[PDB]
Ligand binder design. Structure first.
Ligand SMILES: CCC1=C(C)/C(=C/C2=NC(=C\c3[nH]c(/C=C4\NC(=O)[C@H](C)[C@H]4CC)c(C)c3CCC(=O)O)/C(CCC(=O)O)=C2C)NC1=O
Ligand SMILES: CCC1=C(C)/C(=C/C2=NC(=C\c3[nH]c(/C=C4\NC(=O)[C@H](C)[C@H]4CC)c(C)c3CCC(=O)O)/C(CCC(=O)O)=C2C)NC1=O
Ligand SMILES: CCC1=C(C)/C(=C/C2=NC(=C\c3[nH]c(/C=C4\NC(=O)[C@H](C)[C@H]4CC)c(C)c3CCC(=O)O)/C(CCC(=O)O)=C2C)NC1=O
Ligand SMILES: CCC1=C(C)/C(=C/C2=NC(=C\c3[nH]c(/C=C4\NC(=O)[C@H](C)[C@H]4CC)c(C)c3CCC(=O)O)/C(CCC(=O)O)=C2C)NC1=O
Ligand SMILES: CCC1=C(C)/C(=C/C2=NC(=C\c3[nH]c(/C=C4\NC(=O)[C@H](C)[C@H]4CC)c(C)c3CCC(=O)O)/C(CCC(=O)O)=C2C)NC1=O
Ligand SMILES: CCC1=C(C)/C(=C/C2=NC(=C\c3[nH]c(/C=C4\NC(=O)[C@H](C)[C@H]4CC)c(C)c3CCC(=O)O)/C(CCC(=O)O)=C2C)NC1=O
Ligand SMILES: CCC1=C(C)/C(=C/C2=NC(=C\c3[nH]c(/C=C4\NC(=O)[C@H](C)[C@H]4CC)c(C)c3CCC(=O)O)/C(CCC(=O)O)=C2C)NC1=O
Ligand SMILES: CCC1=C(C)/C(=C/C2=NC(=C\c3[nH]c(/C=C4\NC(=O)[C@H](C)[C@H]4CC)c(C)c3CCC(=O)O)/C(CCC(=O)O)=C2C)NC1=O
Ligand SMILES: CCC1=C(C)/C(=C\C2=NC(=C\c3[nH]c(/C=C4\NC(=O)[C@H](C)[C@H]4CC)c(C)c3CCC(=O)O)/C(CCC(=O)O)=C2C)NC1=O
Lengths: 92, 160, 173, 106, 161, 160, 161, 160, 160, 161, 161
């Protein structure tokens, strides 16, 4: 149910990003970034806005913030808008 | 370079390079000094290959330069000899970084659409590079003629 | 897919045995022609745009019915340039995927990415399989012209283009 | 000095953290499987095996109080290095002041 | 991303010149030290779980952050914290292989510090663990490989400060 | 927590708590006095549950206390018992909160990644919790030992 | 979110302590008044439609706001009007149950003052509409039940001004 | 296989084989007769490697052959060395193929689920493979022992 | 049912039910005697609850039965009271099921689309259910009339 | 999915009837056994790894399917084998709580026989592993709950042949 | 999104009144010029690929941008340059048809000055590319219709700098 059940190297599930969020976590950030396509010049799809500011859950910020980096994007700011800091229980 | 392809190919799987991937870096890095002499010979003949290749494209495509074409003129023909300081320059960048990325990040990507803005026959430059490969073979021996040969074909296949 | 080494290594793993001389003789036969299988692929890379024009021209000179109207049964041929463009695209798929299998020494890449689902797609668009088997065999006859002196390069070249015709063909006999 | 004294208060706080369990496991019966009598096969642990004794012997012992003790020994090394640097600085000041009280330019 | 080779290609391309003598000289240093880096990257990949385990113990298991009331107290925060160190050790090996620290600015230090500040992760204690990881790895690969690995462990810290 | 966990399931659908969900919260606060009493019974029998439960663990798993095991040494054995007091404390949080959210968020999420980084066999931590569960079930009533065992069982499933 | 039960578990866990006497007293304060919140929580969920209909007509119905050119003029703007008031009433009921207004800061007051200022929503009128919604909701659940109820309506208005 | 790796990488980009992949395949075909020699030396010395390899494993981990250990008994110790023979076989497959793909698909994917559901300490299988690698590298020359060490190293990293 | 929502909710996470989730099932089967008795008391008062409910509805809404209203005529008023019997039957299912999910899955999903197509005012069906709630709540005790009224108020909220 | 309660409601609603005496007795049969099912469900979740571990050793642990050529040979196929056994144990526990095998039709058995025929998994050896897993479970939960669990173990085997 | 007629309706609607005398002349003004706009957008669409060809050659062709070190150097950067001008010309055509420049704010300038600033694209050169393209269009579509297309070109330049 949560991403930290022990799945690592030499397991049956393929290696991916693992989050430290609890089951049904409810912490969300507020991020800002630019992400060019870097593939439109051989697909010829439509043009889209690449300047984004959105709320992203804690459960996906590791994967999203790690995907923006792989695809050449640049993160301009990130803040926590929902949730407590160093809370032991009460993140659900 | 070849190390940036292995490091990037492994990073999206979230792992270290494998035993066969680390061998790709080892063999390439050991052949780095032979690639460092080959591209120096090319830089010494950059002014002469144009002299042989410029002869070829115009006897093969004489309709481009004659009156009746739109882009010819005594005005622009002055700085002609500085041209292949750009294209075979990329061929020296690709001979050093032993792969096609410098020839593909620059050059091939967007080269067709780049010329279609004008309406120029794109088949001319495809033949311009093919005759360029004909030019680079006489100023170079036969042993390292097989070493720079596969790098030209990628430009023809990329433009086509 | 599986190269020639992986097929021999998987056939021995199925018995739970190590590689003896019989399995090492097979791997040596690929390590002998391996340096020659690259000269063939580098030739295709240099002549790729030429080998497709001549295969297309020789195909339409013998099958003039493909460049003409489709008939009320809406057969998909090279009637219009929208169809002519799409059908020349297919001739590259046969040439590209046949160059891969010449370096793999095995037809596993051919069926796993070309043949599984091909007749279902051509029967869906009504594309003729007869002419398609011919142009695959015209590419074989052309590429063998560059390699005439030594005949061990003809066997390597015919393997990918023969497999596609034997597996796309209908079993009449 | 006054961050070495903060290291000693962390060693005293690390022992009080584990002292309900350090004395609670002191009257348990902890019998091992090998290592003590020679009639049982112990393998590597007849003694210790092949380089694994360490540079000191205390570096192979794990624990919260052994780990803050290695912090103390690296913090007392930097205090003793600079306390021996004020000794020979104080020598050169006196050896230049012996020139001053001798009849000279100052 | 750019390695030692692409750095001279990216440089000569913007001015538009061919590679000169001085540019060729530093590439010789990278090519000569090639098998030194490939051997180091192989041993770090096998002893990855061992380098992080005694770097955390030498740095974090003694302080008060593993006790209640500190970061990485709970198991959820102890697993998340040794997960980061597995990334720092993997990206530092990419830098030693590529011979250039540019990959750390793009895929490590890209929005990472601002994430720690909101969450409340101590930036000083993170530097202490990456620094302890630097000597622990310097004993496995030797002094030569250990010095190159220290250029990218020190790089992650100088940008995280 | 029963109250927190039922407000999240109603905040997702964006609706008020239904009569079925308010009836479960009502039967939880009605059992508040009895839960505060069971948590009090474990809180005051700490030494006996940790001392008796840990002694049984070192008899069923002598390898953890033999040379080469994780809990070899007087500080390593005392820390092995420090963990059992952690899981006993979290069990009292779970009995009072009406659910296992205090146990799961603190010491169940990432427990396998933690103990694998310390070198501890997770099957020995699960055997130590099973030795505390019967020592704690002998100090409670018939119906209280049955309810307390539910929270010890859940810590066993999540630790395998 | 953290309720009254979780908030005392948090205070104890950050010290490593069990639940002492001061903690068990706060827990009985929640359990003793618990079945009163469950009864008040069902009474407001049944009268939610009328608590909003009487608060709006009494506060901002024939006001200039509903005339042409104001806010809540179009039918969508009117429907977004009464859709917001039900959001506050539904979340103030979540807080009275949990006995801790932590759910209001994460899912209601999460930067709601900037959103209302950008769109041009009159903050002075929304605070008086929530206040008007407090006088009709208080006459339903009584004074003892309204104490914890009105404790969160003022939390939204105070966190909104 | 490194050949299969280079054909599927060019397939994803929808382009022919590039010069960076055609010289890498040349390095592999040119190094073929040397791999078949090394892989056949480990195949002819299986008993001395598996038997010596398990010998040194039973001295670094005596708890697996003690009463209650996993490999305790004559039939369980024989199954212990059955597994060291599987992983020596898969290592020879990986040396002939030029990459670690045959090791990954056979005995590395899900290896933790298997040993966790059998009761075997995964750290003891990695400690036995590390002891076979020492006997395996004693039969080879200085430079061939480094070539084979990469394939033994990949197995350990995946088993940790 | 309370059991159904606990099983589907724990299937989306792919795990077993927790002790907090199993207590809600124990607490629910304990109240099965009271639920079967309250549903029986309503089933025995069908003609009074329905006829009494539809009698008061035509005084608070006299237009629905006058000339021009939807329920004008004996046949139409008969089907008028037929609908109130559907929701009384659904309310007895929810009281026995332990939650309002039978009322929702039967006669609340798409209720506004159904009644808008038939030409029936949905506001009148909610007024007729509120009148049945007062009649049904006058036949019960102190606490049994409180929970049964919650099942009548849920239907009206979802019907507006 | 529908449990024993909803299965009685649907049988009545499909006729338009209220719950009569014949259906009320079925509702009493479930309430009387509700405490026994919640007790067995908690013990199965805690001993799941040992029920699968002992059903595998007894049925297929040293058989032909261990060794090369047989199915479940490689570790990726051994690990997929015991992931299927963890489906049947968990879904047989849902059916025992609900008292209705409806959830085994939708989320388990619907189209499961064709999946195994395409993959090549032996059905006869799978049924023997569930039967060995039924005997180990019946000894942990007792004789009364043990024959309830076996009621939904046989639904999977008969729905699989 | 809103064109001229929907903006003149919004003026009378925001005061709740009916369309009086002055409102129709603003409507007839757009109606009388409706044919002049649609005939201009027909000629622009047919000469799109050529209208850009001189605009690049008019301002940015021989500059330092196409040379190394400047922007537009690489082929990928040149193709992105002319691809951006095509979207400016199309959206500038949509705005002239609607007679209201609102469409340029929502679907053009939303995040454009920030995108260009992050990549390093020169705002001064792009302003000359559109000012260059604005003059050539005035020749094809004519003098009167050419100014209307110019009114939406300067709107893009004014809000872009
Ligand atoms: C890599 C293996 C592979 C192959 C071969 C392949 C073929 C393929 N050929 C297609 C169409 C087509 N193919 C042809 C081909 C021909 N017409 C003739 O008369 C000749 C017999 C033949 C040329 C030699 C035509 C005309 C169409 C378009 C049919 C239509 O749209 O009417 C299409 C549908 C268009 C699309 O791609 O979206 C596919 C998928 N796809 C694959 O993945
Ligand atoms: C409905 C629009 C449409 C057209 C026109 C079209 C033409 C078309 N012309 C072709 C070839 C050809 N077309 C021409 C000649 C000419 N073509 C001209 O429009 C000129 C009048 C003349 C040159 C002065 C020649 C000589 C060939 C054969 C080239 C070859 O051998 O490949 C082919 C290739 C197959 C063939 O016919 O041999 C197509 C598909 N397709 C279309 O979908
Ligand atoms: C509240 C949830 C929670 C848990 C459970 C937790 C565990 C935890 N266990 C630790 C160590 C340890 N834990 C053990 C445990 C064991 N050795 C054995 O043989 C047994 C199998 C097992 C206990 C039953 C040992 C030996 C250490 C010391 C390891 C070292 O210092 O290298 C440490 C590092 C030092 C310390 O502070 O104790 C943490 C943080 N932290 C938490 O926040
Ligand atoms: C590859 C580049 C990269 C990194 C490194 C990265 C880190 C990162 N660390 C995180 C949290 C965290 N990181 C830590 C780390 C630590 N605690 C300590 O005491 C130590 C000082 C430190 C370990 C060295 C902790 C405890 C959290 C959880 C914070 C919380 O839950 O409140 C999070 C929030 C999401 C999540 O935890 O799943 C991200 C995104 N992201 C990236 O893209
Ligand atoms: C769950 C917590 C939460 C809140 C509170 C929330 C508010 C919120 N109110 C909105 C609009 C609005 N809000 C109002 C509100 C008012 N008009 C008045 O006269 C009063 C002063 C006031 C209250 C009745 C109006 C009229 C709009 C429509 C604005 C528009 O359509 O442009 C919008 C824009 C989306 C939309 O058009 O529906 C949001 C996101 N969103 C949330 O997620
Ligand atoms: C179990 C959930 C459920 C409901 C509620 C339901 C309603 C339903 N109401 C109907 C008609 C009707 N419903 C009414 C209802 C009313 N007239 C009034 O004045 C009142 C305001 C209102 C409520 C008493 C009337 C008058 C008709 C007949 C309409 C006509 O004949 O024109 C019909 C069409 C005839 C029939 O099949 O009976 C259906 C199916 N079906 C369902 O499955
Ligand atoms: C080709 C990839 C592959 C592997 C590796 C594999 C392992 C494997 N190991 C097994 C057992 C076993 N494996 C061991 C192994 C060990 N005991 C120790 O103490 C050591 C740490 C360790 C060996 C170094 C033992 C003792 C058993 C028997 C366990 C039992 O019977 O309960 C079994 C069950 C019996 C059988 O069917 O053979 C399998 C299938 N199968 C595969 O297909
Ligand atoms: C509809 C409104 C709209 C616009 C205009 C838009 C532009 C836009 N321009 C981009 C890049 C770019 N744009 C340029 C543009 C220029 N270089 C020059 O020298 C010139 C002065 C200038 C053009 C006149 C360049 C060079 C890049 C690529 C930068 C790089 O690759 O480093 C990108 C990144 C995606 C990609 O390049 O594939 C977007 C999304 N997006 C939108 O939604
Ligand atoms: C990789 C290096 C690189 C180049 C060159 C480039 C862009 C570039 N150089 C061009 C023309 C050019 N056209 C000529 C001359 C001619 N053209 C020919 O093919 C004949 C030799 C002759 C026929 C008249 C020359 C020498 C250039 C390069 C720069 C210039 O002189 O304008 C054109 C066509 C439109 C134009 O700018 O006028 C582009 C787009 N981008 C790049 O990244």
């Amino acid at each position: 149910a949560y991403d930290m059940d022990g799945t690592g190297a030499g397991s049956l599930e393929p290696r991916g990003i693992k989050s430290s969020a609890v089951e049904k976590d409810s912490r969300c950030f507020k991020v800002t970034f630019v992400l060019p396509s870097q593939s439109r010049l051989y697909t010829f799809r439509e043009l889209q806005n690449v300047y984004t500011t959105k709320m992203v859950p804690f459960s996906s910020w590791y994967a999203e913030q790690q995907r923006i980096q792989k695809m050449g994007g640049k993160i301009l700011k990130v803040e926590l808008v929902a949730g407590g800091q160093m809370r032991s229980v009460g993140n659900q | 370079s070849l190390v940036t392809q292995v490091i990037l190919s492994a990073d999206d799987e979230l792992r270290y390079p494998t035993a066969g991937e680390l061998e790709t870096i080892s063999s390439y890095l050991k052949t780095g000094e032979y690639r460092i002499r080959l591209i120096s010979i090319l830089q010494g003949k950059e002014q002469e290959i144009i002299r042989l290749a410029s002869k070829k494209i115009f006897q093969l495509h004489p309709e481009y330069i004659a009156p009746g074409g739109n882009a010819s003129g005594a005005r622009q023909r002055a700085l002609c000899l500085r041209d292949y300081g750009w294209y075979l320059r990329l061929i020296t960048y690709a001979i050093l970084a032993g792969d096609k990325e410098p020839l593909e990040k620059i050059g091939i990507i967007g080269v067709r659409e780049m010329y279609n803005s004008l309406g120029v026959p794109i088949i001319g430059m495809i033949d311009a590079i093919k005759c360029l490969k004909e030019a680079t073979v006489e100023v170079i021996s036969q042993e390292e003629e097989d070493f720079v040969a596969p790098y030209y074909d990628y430009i023809i296949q990329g433009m086509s | 897919m599986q190269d020639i080494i992986t097929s021999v290594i998987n056939q021995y793993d199925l018995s739970g045995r190590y590689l003896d001389i019989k399995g090492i003789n097979q791997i040596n036969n690929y390590f002998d022609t391996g340096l020659k299988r690259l000269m063939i692929a580098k030739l295709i890379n240099k002549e790729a745009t030429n080998l497709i024009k001549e295969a297309s021209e020789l195909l339409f000179i013998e099958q003039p019915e493909l460049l003409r109207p489709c008939g009320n049964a809406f057969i998909g041929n090279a009637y219009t340039t929208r169809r002519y463009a799409a059908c020349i695209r297919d001739i590259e798929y046969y040439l590209r995927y046949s160059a891969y299998s010449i370096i793999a020494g095995n037809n596993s890449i051919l069926d796993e990415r070309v043949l599984d689902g091909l007749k279902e797609t051509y029967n869906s668009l009504l594309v003729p399989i007869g002419p398609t088997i011919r142009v695959i065999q015209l590419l074989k006859e052309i590429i063998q012209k560059k390699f005439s002196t030594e005949n061990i390069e003809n066997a390597i070249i015919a393997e990918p283009f023969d497999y596609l015709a034997i597996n796309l063909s209908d079993k009449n006999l | 000095q006054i961050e070495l004294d903060a290291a000693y208060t962390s060693l005293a706080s690390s022992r009080a953290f584990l002292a309900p369990f350090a004395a609670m496991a002191a009257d348990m019966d902890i019998r091992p499987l090998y290592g003590k009598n020679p009639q049982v096969f112990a393998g590597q642990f007849l003694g210790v095996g092949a380089g694994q004794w360490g540079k000191t012997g205390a570096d192979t012992v794990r624990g919260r109080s052994r780990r803050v003790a290695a912090d103390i020994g690296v913090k007392e090394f930097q205090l003793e290095r600079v306390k021996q640097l004020v000794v020979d600085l104080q020598r050169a000041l006196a050896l230049e002041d012996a020139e001053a009280d001798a009849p000279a330019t100052s | 991303m750019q390695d030692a080779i692409t750095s001279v290609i990216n440089a000569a391309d913007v001015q538009g010149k061919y590679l000169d003598a001085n540019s060729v000289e530093k590439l010789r240093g990278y090519f000569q030290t090639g098998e030194l880096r490939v051997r180091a990257a192989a041993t770090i990949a096998a002893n990855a779980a061992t380098i992080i385990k005694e770097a955390v113990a030498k740095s974090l298991l003694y302080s008060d952050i593993t006790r209640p009331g500190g970061n990485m107290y709970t198991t959820r925060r102890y697993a998340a914290c040794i997960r980061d160190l597995d990334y720092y050790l993997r990206y530092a090996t990419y830098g030693m292989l590529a011979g250039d620290p540019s990959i750390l600015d793009e895929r490590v230090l890209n929005g990472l510090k601002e994430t720690y500040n909101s969450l409340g992760v101590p930036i000083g204690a993170t530097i202490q663990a990456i620094q302890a990881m630097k000597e622990v790895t310097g004993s496995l690969v030797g002094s030569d490989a250990g010095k190159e690995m220290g250029l990218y462990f020190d790089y992650i810290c100088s940008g995280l400060s | 927590s029963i109250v927190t966990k039922s407000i999240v399931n109603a905040d997702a659908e964006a609706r008020y708590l239904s009569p079925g969900e308010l009836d479960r919260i009502k039967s939880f606060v009605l059992s508040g006095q009895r839960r505060l009493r069971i948590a009090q019974t474990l809180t005051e029998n700490r030494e006996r549950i940790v001392k008796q439960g840990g002694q049984q663990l070192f008899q069923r798993r002598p390898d953890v206390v033999s040379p080469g095991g994780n809990a070899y040494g007087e500080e390593m054995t005392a820390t092995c018992l420090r963990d059992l007091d952690y899981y006993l404390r979290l069990v009292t949080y779970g009995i009072i909160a009406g659910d296992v959210t205090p146990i799961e968020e603190i010491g169940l999420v990432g427990v396998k990644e933690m103990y694998s980084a310390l070198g501890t066999p997770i099957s020995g931590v699960a055997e130590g919790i099973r030795c505390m569960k019967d020592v704690a079930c002998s100090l409670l009533s018939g119906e209280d030992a049955a309810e307390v065992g539910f929270y010890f069982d859940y810590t066993l499933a999540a630790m395998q």
